[PDB]
Amino acid sequence: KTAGRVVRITGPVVDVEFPRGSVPELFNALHAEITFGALAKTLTLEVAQHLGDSLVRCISMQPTDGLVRGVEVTDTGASISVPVGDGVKGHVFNALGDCLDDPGYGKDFEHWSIHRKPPAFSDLEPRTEMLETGLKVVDLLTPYVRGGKIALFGGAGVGKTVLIQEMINRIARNFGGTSVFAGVGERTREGNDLWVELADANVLKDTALVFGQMDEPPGTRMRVALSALTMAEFFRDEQGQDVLLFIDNIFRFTQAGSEVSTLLGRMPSAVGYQPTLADEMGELQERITSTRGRSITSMQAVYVPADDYTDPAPATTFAHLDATTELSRAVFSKGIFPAVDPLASSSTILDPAIVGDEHYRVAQEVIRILQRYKDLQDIIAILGIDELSEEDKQLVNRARRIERFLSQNMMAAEQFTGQPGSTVPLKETIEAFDKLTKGEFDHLPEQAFFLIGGLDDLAKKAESLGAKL
Amino acid sequence: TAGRVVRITGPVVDVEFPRGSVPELFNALHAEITFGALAKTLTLEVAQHLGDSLVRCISMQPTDGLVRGVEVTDTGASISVPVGDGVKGHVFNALGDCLDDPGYGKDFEHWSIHRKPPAFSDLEPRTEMLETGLKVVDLLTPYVRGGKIALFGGAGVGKTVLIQEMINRIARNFGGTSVFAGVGERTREGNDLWVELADANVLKDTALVFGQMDEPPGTRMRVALSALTMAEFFRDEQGQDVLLFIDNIFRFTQAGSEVSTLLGRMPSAVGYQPTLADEMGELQERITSTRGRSITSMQAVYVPADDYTDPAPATTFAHLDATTELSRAVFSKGIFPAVDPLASSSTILDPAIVGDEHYRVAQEVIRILQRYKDLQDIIAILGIDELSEEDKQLVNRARRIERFLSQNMMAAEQFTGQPGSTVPLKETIEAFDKLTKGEFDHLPEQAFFLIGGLDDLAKKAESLGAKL
Amino acid sequence: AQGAQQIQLMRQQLIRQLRTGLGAEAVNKAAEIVRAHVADPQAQSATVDRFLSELEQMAPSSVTSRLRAASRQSLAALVEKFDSVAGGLDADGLTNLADELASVAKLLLSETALNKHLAEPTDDSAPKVRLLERLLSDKVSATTLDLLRTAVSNRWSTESNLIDAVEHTARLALLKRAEIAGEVDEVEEQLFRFGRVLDAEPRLSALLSDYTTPAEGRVALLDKALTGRPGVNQTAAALLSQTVGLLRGERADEAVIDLAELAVSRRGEVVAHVSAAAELSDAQRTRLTEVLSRIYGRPVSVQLHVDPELLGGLSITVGDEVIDGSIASRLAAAQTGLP
Amino acid sequence: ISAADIEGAIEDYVSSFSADTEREEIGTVIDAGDGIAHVEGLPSVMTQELLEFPGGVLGVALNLDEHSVGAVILGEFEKIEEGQQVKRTGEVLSVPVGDAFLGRVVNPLGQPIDGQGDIAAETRRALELQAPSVVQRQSVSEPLQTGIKAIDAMTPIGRGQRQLIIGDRKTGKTAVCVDTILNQREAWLTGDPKQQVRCVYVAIGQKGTTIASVKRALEEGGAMEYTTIVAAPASDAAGFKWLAPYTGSAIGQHWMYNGKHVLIVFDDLSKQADAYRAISLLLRRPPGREAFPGDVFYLHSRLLERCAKLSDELGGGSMTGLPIIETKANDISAFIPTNVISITDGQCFLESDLFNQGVRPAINVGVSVSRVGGAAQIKAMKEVAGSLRLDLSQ
Amino acid sequence: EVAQTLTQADQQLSAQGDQVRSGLESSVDGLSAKLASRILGVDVNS
Ligand SMILES: Nc1ncnc2c1ncn2[C@@H]1O[C@H](COP(=O)(O)OP(=O)(O)OP(=O)(O)O)[C@@H](O)[C@H]1O
Ligand SMILES: Nc1ncnc2c1ncn2[C@@H]1O[C@H](COP(=O)(O)OP(=O)(O)OP(=O)(O)O)[C@@H](O)[C@H]1O
Ligand SMILES: Nc1ncnc2c1ncn2[C@@H]1O[C@H](COP(=O)(O)OP(=O)(O)O)[C@@H](O)[C@H]1O
Ligand SMILES: [Mg+2]
Ligand SMILES: [Mg+2]
Ligand SMILES: [Mg+2]
């Protein structure tokens, strides 16, 4: 016939020999069969390289345990495809398009290949419409962009997932469009929690969930993002419906790529990463984008290994974003939630042209005060605050109050603390931080500013402490 | 008898020759690039005998457009450059081609650029101070006539400006011959030096050899050897005093490391070739004065990423008689020349050669600067008021001393508009003795910034309201 | 001014869209008319004749390869020695020589150490000749011993080159006996046909292209499947059988193609593969042979691979150079050549 | 809108259509993947020759050995398969060049990507023509005003100079370069080519919408009339990212050698270095520090040495370079930043700390320098800003 | 006013382009026939 046979197996990577003239194209899906009892299954191999001599190196989506050399391998003749349409909403899928909450569902749907080129450059248009979230720190210092790309960077356990949940609550809840969530190499129980929460909040009927989680082979963990992005692309390009795309975690896509590259025999780059790290990341990211008249607001949680922000993965990820919230271990240690580093975070739309002159002025004054406090940390760690000048002492008190007031009781934090969250209008945020920067609340105790919403909450908490606003 | 190209990989070309016609190591071979846009004649240098009648060679020119299987011709000798008095006043490339007058010097005597260093029995240590008129150099890093001088520093700290200043101060009145070797530096800088030497009328005594950073690794590896071959001819044959300026000698090592792995060599630490020290010694041991034949060599040494512990500068250190080490910290303070007084050194800075007064004043300056360096962080954190009276006095003296070590350099006018100054050694010693004794503590430290001798100090102090 | 520039750009863009649409429709209609006009076989013949004329209007080309210079020279010496030796040999003698040489080649392949020792280049070959004589002076005939001593006396870059040279000499003997018989064209045609059928059945070649199994078994498989047929030429059969028997990690189809190339090269010609949409006429074949020989100087044999997708003209590949006169190439160029 | 023009053009093309046959040297793909291919054959291919793959795909021959040719696919490598036929083009890698490239956005091969039709190329220029020699240049003497006081006074940039803009992400590097491009609007409006500056903005590994934002900013300020963008977005293959600066340099060099003054911005060379490292690793060349190839310094040295100030004998044209480098955690000691700092004629070093303090542009005065100095300033600026940088350092 | 002029011109040019396209529909046959003549190397009447 024309089927190949397995010749080499090195974990997830498989070498397959085909008859001449039947070598499958790159990224084609191939099917092999594992027949051993407990592990019996059908393997989907994605062609990754042509090795010559009619050999192809392929990445397996399922574990290859139990696979035998010489077993027949059949070429599907196309790449991995996933179901698309309004039918995907409300259902949970895996990287290959199989429905998990209801097996067999979506087999009759239109199927789109998970590999496609990004939009033509001529169709790209910069997006600068502010997306108001109701979080003080985000709205003030890192205003999110509607139809733009937002990222949440952070080491282990600084609050990336909780912030993703917060943004799902604040944005996807009262959203007229569709939402796509892509769990990429994260906790499976987190996927179950998200499923149940979306069902409870009635947002699930408008959301499509695709999960390739930690206990998956690197091939699945590097293709699940493509699958979810394909569903989002269908919603963007075929139904003209505003799309929300939450991804957690994209660094796991990079990590799976690194593992595959190691298995594929590629010569490692710096820090052991794949040589094609930036290229793979760009190929993925340029697909996540709004086009003229077609909006995708994407929000990606990016894991920072060992709290190292100079690691190649996040370092290359930084360039693909319109807004970048950076969660810091130190801020988290102080108890400030969300543990945003206001000096390392940024937004392309935080300029006087877009957000107005007063918003920009207040943000810049807050940043200046916090930068001066950061500079003075060296003195303060040794001698405390009392060796500073009167100007610097006043600035330090103001800065401590400001950094506490950037924290907020989040909606998604209720499950942890039992305290309901708060929403602060942008105008109130600007007014409040203008008052802070001018020293109108210097008399209030610091804890009065901790985990509250607007100025009314500030007054109530200050009164409960003992100071009157 | 001709060979043929077998493998091309960047600047490294493998060539197969008929058995019995394999060229000797370091022989120059010729290949043709016939493509119209890049038509040229490549000079390859045999680097290795791979066996089976194959040789690995380093191209002196870009290999773009080279084809497999093209004829390769063996010249039978190494790269050779013209020597004689005709080189003076002209610009050459690494291969001996005249740039400002193509075809010039083809009839001169040609010397191979590969040569053993002088016999050890002909080596005589040089202990004779070469005055420059720069306060910091003359006081703390006195240069040696016929000795080896280096200017160490990171990128953009003043090495090239200092080399130009020393060309102005030393070579202009020099009675002998000067050789400048641009090694992997900016072509614009080479043009500026050419024009400046022409303007000063120093060019007629100077031979310029350029291989710039846009050239392939082979040219940057062999340009220093070419210039040194010309200088060696002037030393051994013509029997005249030679000035040799090299900028930048680190580029020789860097070019060596660029092709090291393509030659099949396992990397050493910090990504350098295993034969770092050997190649550096082969090149440097030729840069020397012999008994009765003088070469005063001055080399700019780039320190990668300001790291003085990097293998290349660390290896280079041992080959020098005097070293002026420029610092990024001094540079960023605004002191110029950005010399690091505590790190620079000179083998003739001892009482026997420079005399008791000079040595004592230099040592006292070094002690004051070391103490100030120790107290700097204390001052930064706890403030200066918490020092003792002696420490406060020392800090004032040290700040004035560090400012006074700066000087308005002749070659720095384009960067400041201020004409340069020259301070005689006696005046430098006297002024720094006075500074260490505290006789100028009544003047603002700003009075000591970028001035010449004591008269300039008095004038600037007057302009600032102080009196000297 | 910005508004005026935008208006002008819009005008230019509209002109561009109209031009692109017009050109696309025109070129599609051109493709349709071309595919309709090429249907007539007379049209095919006319296109072929025009391409032939283009060839006669073309200037001549300026112009075992895997062997190194040393091994190539050694093999040249070996082949000229064989040519001198074979003058007196007869058909049965040549067959015995080929069988003995193939046996010696398989002996060397099986016995790696002896071939290794026998392959190291040395200034004096007397020890090697003594080793051969002590080994197989009586086992093989005088001519085989002379050829083997010549082969060892020369220089081989790598040990496998010696086995390659011995196999080359065996094939040389088989082709020489074929030439003496007078079936040179028949054996060439049969070898090319075997190459074609192996190419059609890649799996058969892959099964035959493994030396992990005994040689006799695969030779028997070849005999049963392809070689053992009523019309197969005896010399081609023996040549292919020995080649498959001596296979060392090469595909049977590639080996057969190499065998055909060697068989044609013995006459001094070069094989050129010509793809056409329709079978050429005998006058067309003669004209093509003449013009290709003129272009490449030495005469060339022509192999035809009819393929309707060419839509006339010819695609001639030879010596790693392709002249693509196929009308399909012209249509593709016109499609992609639009402004 | 004249239809007769449309017909005329189509008829002219069809008449000009001559798909005449010719002899071509071929090869065969033996293995491909990750944007690299290996080709058997091509006995006469020359180093860094453009190769044609089926389907309109282009590659470049980098490794030439006795067996095969290791080639880098310049875009759309997913269609490359074993056994495909590869053609020679008989010419080293080169791009079209001409005045028509002004106002356009092209990829590293010069093909338009703004969807505005073909570009009329005056001629073609090879990408590896060597830089002017020591004798072919003249000293930098003409200012290139950026409109930014902190730069024009303290680190002046002259025509024919390479000034490095180096700093952490979001420190204002692109802002400085785009402001410099926009500042040449008056010089362009003069109409005097001795004063006009033609700008080339090379975007390497940048997000597509970011390049669109840059183009929009240039449009609004009128700069797009005298500016060309060579775009190699993040989605592109490593070949384009590696090749884009050389394409922009060739386009600028065509104007420079014809008496025009050019300003080229490389945004940024860090991503070009990463793309070159990826290509070299995929070709399995021996890596060096941080996995970069041994000749990564040469990659940028030969690129930035083409930015020169030609002598009067060559027309007096110039090309000013503004390479951009991104540092991580303010580490100018990293390999690529140190490489580039040692190439350019000074640097403007931008700080997040200074930026947050309100010092914008965030020039670190102590560390930033211009190696041309007063020669790149007018007499009045020299007189007033004689020692400003030194005073600020003190 | 720039936007108003732009939309007016867009409509006017769209109408002009549509009607010129309709007018030139005819010549496509001759264009294709003559291009095919060029491709085949011999004039094709069709
Ligand atoms: N807003 C918040 N209020 C209170 N506690 C919080 C908040 N955000 C995070 N936490 C605490 O931090 C823990 C980690 O949060 P989260 O899972 O969102 O972090 P992460 O950055 O996604 O972590 P990981 O690297 O493990 O995926 C939460 O379980 C909770 O204990
Ligand atoms: N002089 C300035 N004054 C105020 N804001 C500025 C100034 N220059 C730049 N900015 C703002 O700083 C932010 C970063 O600017 P820019 O995009 O030029 O930086 P960059 O270093 O190129 O960034 P990236 O890492 O995204 O490439 C943008 O919001 C820009 O508007
Ligand atoms: N004596 C000086 N006075 C003022 N500026 C100087 C002086 N020396 C160097 N500089 C500044 O530092 C820059 C770097 O000097 P240069 O020697 O060219 O670099 P490098 O040290 O890398 O060779 C100069 O371009 C100049 O602007
Ligand atoms: Mg998480
Ligand atoms: Mg220098
Ligand atoms: Mg930027």
Short mmCIF file of N, CA, C and O and ligand atoms in Angstrom, two decimals, chain B residues 156 159-161 185-186 189 247-248, chain D residues 371, ligand 5:
data_model
loop_
_atom_site.label_atom_id
_atom_site.label_comp_id
_atom_site.label_asym_id
_atom_site.label_seq_id
_atom_site.Cartn_x
_atom_site.Cartn_y
_atom_site.Cartn_z
N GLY B 156 34.58 52.23 24.38
CA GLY B 156 34.26 53.65 24.49
C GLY B 156 34.66 54.32 25.78
O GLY B 156 33.89 55.12 26.32
N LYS B 159 40.35 54.80 24.75
CA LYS B 159 41.58 54.18 24.26
C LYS B 159 42.04 54.82 22.96
O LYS B 159 43.22 55.17 22.82
N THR B 160 41.14 54.97 21.99
CA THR B 160 41.54 55.54 20.70
C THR B 160 41.95 57.00 20.85
O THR B 160 42.92 57.45 20.23
N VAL B 161 41.21 57.76 21.65
CA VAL B 161 41.57 59.15 21.90
C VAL B 161 42.95 59.22 22.53
O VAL B 161 43.77 60.08 22.20
N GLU B 185 39.29 47.78 13.81
CA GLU B 185 38.65 48.98 14.34
C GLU B 185 37.87 49.68 13.23
O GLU B 185 37.73 49.18 12.12
N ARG B 186 37.33 50.85 13.56
CA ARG B 186 36.41 51.53 12.67
C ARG B 186 37.15 52.13 11.48
O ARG B 186 38.19 52.76 11.64
N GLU B 189 37.58 55.82 11.76
CA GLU B 189 38.73 56.19 12.58
C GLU B 189 40.02 56.12 11.78
O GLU B 189 40.90 56.97 11.94
N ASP B 247 45.97 49.37 17.32
CA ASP B 247 44.62 49.61 17.82
C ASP B 247 43.67 48.84 16.91
O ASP B 247 43.49 49.24 15.76
N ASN B 248 43.06 47.74 17.37
CA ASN B 248 43.10 47.22 18.73
C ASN B 248 43.67 45.81 18.71
O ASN B 248 43.26 44.98 17.91
N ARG D 371 31.13 59.70 19.29
CA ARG D 371 32.54 59.64 18.91
C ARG D 371 32.89 60.60 17.79
O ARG D 371 34.04 60.61 17.35
MG MG F 5 38.58 52.80 19.86
#
